[PDB]
Design a protein around this ligand. Structure first.
Ligand SMILES: [Co+2]
Ligand SMILES: [Co+2]
Ligand SMILES: [Co+2]
Ligand SMILES: [Co+2]
Ligand SMILES: [Co+2]
Ligand SMILES: [Co+2]
Ligand SMILES: [Co+2]
Ligand SMILES: [Co+2]
Lengths: 80, 80, 80, 80
């Protein structure tokens, strides 16, 4: 990643690994080590992601928001 | 939220997302991104919440307390 | 507690809540909010506890050790 | 360990305890408190490890990488 990986990884139902970085992104990494997608927030993603029953990925950011990200890497919503 | 979301979200049995904020609050957010409730502690909620078998939400605060919050957002107890 | 509760709580099989504090202790709190026991390490317990299959509670400390604590609050071992 | 254990332990299917240290290593500790192996990254391992379905251990490092480590302590891959 572009900065410290302070965030703790979460593992999806299909093995996808999700983790934040101080480079401001939430990363979705395939089990083979190849990027699935990254999603840019406005600040360090120190928070560790959680995965909902429908696969939504939730994570906080130092930009003050809680993010809900769809499994395909598109924003679902953010809460300030 | 009002400050960095350092805390890592927890997901309840009904999909509710709980997370602390450096704005001093524990947040309960519905899966649709709308606030269910927030609970104010005396300092940053860096700690990440855990959910008990009866749904109680437990989280630490930089105000020195461990909080137990009922699912409706009312204080159950705090331990110094 | 005596200092910031940075650590994230873990919940045991019987509902006991375990959490570290920057006051250097690992706390075991009953679901009713009353202390079961506390265990003193040599520095802040920022690490969040994990519970093994036999109930052992594991947590790191800023004193450089990983601690294994028995369910009764007595040290099992520490690893430097 | 050689430095603060900020990381939060993860427990494997066989009881192995995995945790990072600010000494830059990911540690695998047997339930008896004896080292199984340690793996050196390039910076503090503040991130808390997660365990995949095949036992792979994933953890971030302040060296900017997400690491995937095999259960025997050998690198599987790292993602920058
Ligand atoms: Co750096
Ligand atoms: Co930045
Ligand atoms: Co801010
Ligand atoms: Co404040
Ligand atoms: Co204080
Ligand atoms: Co101290
Ligand atoms: Co030290
Ligand atoms: Co260093």
């Amino acid at each position: 990643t572009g900065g410290s990986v302070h965030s703790s990884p979460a593992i999806g139902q299909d093995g996808t690994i999700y983790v934040g970085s101080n480079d401001h992104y939430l990363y979705a990494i395939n089990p083979n080590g190849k990027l699935k997608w990254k999603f840019e927030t406005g600040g360090s993603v120190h928070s560790s992601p959680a995965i909902g029953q429908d696969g939504t990925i939730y994570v906080g950011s130092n930009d003050h928001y809680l993010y809900a990200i769809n499994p395909n890497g598109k924003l679902k919503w953010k809460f300030e």
